[PDB]
């Protein structure tokens, strides 16, 4: 068994957290394994969960929170509009090659 690539990258595969990017932050576009894309409106911890979360604003009705989490609020916009996922859960897009 040998194929034509070779060889070892040793980087990052020790200490896995909830590493918040630098790019991440409000009115920043961003995309999700399953959860569409959309803008962030929050970036902070919580209070029923530890870590820290970050509110992603769908333009298109596929969320659960309706801008609130178990009575706390963090950004309002519409009901059925919105949604709180980890870091972990974003990446960054920078759509808009030419077009917008």
């Given at each position: 068994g040998s194929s034509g690539s070779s060889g070892q990258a040793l980087a990052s595969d020790s200490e896995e957290a909830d590493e918040v990017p630098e790019w991440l932050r409000e009115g920043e576009f961003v995309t999700v394994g399953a959860h569409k894309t959309?803008?962030?409106?929050?970036?902070?911890?919580?209070?029923?969960?530890?870590?820290?979360?970050?509110?992603?604003?769908?333009?298109?009705?596929?969320?659960?929170n309706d801008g609130s989490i178990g009575g706390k609020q963090y950004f309002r916009?519409?009901?059925?509009?919105?949604?709180?996922?980890?870091?972990?859960?974003?990446?960054?897009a920078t759509s808009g090659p030419s077009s917008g």
């Open positions: 959309g803008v962030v409106r929050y970036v902070g911890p919580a209070d029923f969960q530890e870590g820290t979360w970050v509110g992603v604003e769908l333009d298109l009705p596929s969320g659960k916009c519409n009901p059925g509009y919105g949604l709180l996922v980890r870091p972990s859960r974003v990446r960054r």
